[PDB]
């Protein structure tokens, strides 16, 4: 009654798994928690699991050591494989975003970009979340510090949003797409007994969730409100990782 | 000496003054306060102590006439002109604005038009008061229930305006213009003795500021605070035309 295969079935059927992106989130998660590297044996047990084969994995690895995203040692015959020094400080700067208890009902603002930046957006700090919804003028989320004293910062009235704005924000806030990953997670009822089925299922539900919360806009989601999808999806997959816990690999 | 030669060159010098222009809030001011029509001999007597021909207010008064601003009768060898019932009720509707004790700190607020709406702004009422700051967004003046719902509603944050916006306001709030006028203002110094001077100084002053105050933005005047010029040039005009009193048009 394997939950693994269904799960990758539905996954797929959303958006096609990218291997070597299955393998950043899995190497990410491991040396968040002290497993800084993963053999190749142990790595390659987890991409078969998955139904994939070990071919795959190490084309994948070849993508990812080229573009620097991964590290390579062979001790012996061994082979360990890590995220890059790179990759690993890119990985702590969303830990927040991907593990953390989320924005909740967070404020939205407005900003206007002066006329003589064409690209505003550019010019407006990582630290800063930024939906455009006119050329000039676009709904933010985070420090109000950030914002730049030649930038129009304008604060919500007690009128909800216009259905143009609600149009953005919906699809920006991926409202359909946490409603659609919280509805293929509700088929999860039982954690499996093996350690490697444990591992696997959670790099599974964990890589579905960052490929998410990365694509969508806190911007956007601050101005949905508590009633927005992303409350209950983060809620579901902070449950699962809980109940199939941390797993060392062997 | 005299004070309405120097104001009437003053006045010129900023912006031509147009006499039809003139005549209609001469006509609307008296009509304010009683005087339902003014005699031809009276009109043309206001017409010379300002400088101009009685020519030229012939020429006004048909250019009025067939415009349908002015209504004429002639009760013998006299002529009476008043404003026509559509300009009465236009000028009524401005009333408040031109005599009234102003806005204040009246609030502003920040509108976004849908992308759908080009010519957004013509779909605001005559109660919102609107300055464009961008193609889709305007700052807004007025009853915020009168805001269409499909218009993105945002108010103003602790932060200031930034420059860019505080050239718009400045400029479609006439800060300068204000400025202007009121130090223009400044040189009327003793009230005249005549009822035609003092009846044809109210007239320059009421006329200077009425064009300047239905030109300015209410919303970019918002936008300005309280220590905008609109403000004391509403004060000085307001206590001129209280020291130089209300005139009927005896003459």
Known sequence: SDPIRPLVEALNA??????????????????RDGVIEVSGVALSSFVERMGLQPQAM?????????????????????????????????????????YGPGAGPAPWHLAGMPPDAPD??????????????????????????????????????????????????????????????ERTLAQIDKVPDTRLERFTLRVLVLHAWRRLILRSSPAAEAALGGARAEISCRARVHQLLDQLG???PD
């Open 58 to 98: 190490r084309v994948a690895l070849h993508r990812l050591k080229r573009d620097g995203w991964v590290e390579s040692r062979r001790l012996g015959r061994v082979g360990f494989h890590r995220l890059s020094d790179s990759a690993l400080t890119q990985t702590r700067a969303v830990a927040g975003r991907i």
């Open 120 to 181: 505003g957006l550019s010019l407006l700090p990582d630290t800063l979340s930024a939906t455009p919804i006119s050329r000039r003028f676009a709904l933010i989320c985070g420090p109000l510090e950030d914002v730049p004293e030649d930038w129009l910062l304008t604060a919500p009235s007690g009128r909800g949003l216009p259905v143009w704005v609600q149009d953005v924000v919906v699809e920006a806030g991926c409202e359909a797409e946490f409603k659609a990953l």
């Open 246 to 248: 941390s797993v060392e």
């Open 14 to 31: 959303e958006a096609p798994l990218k291997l070597w992106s299955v393998l950043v989130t899995c190497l990410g998660d491991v040396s």
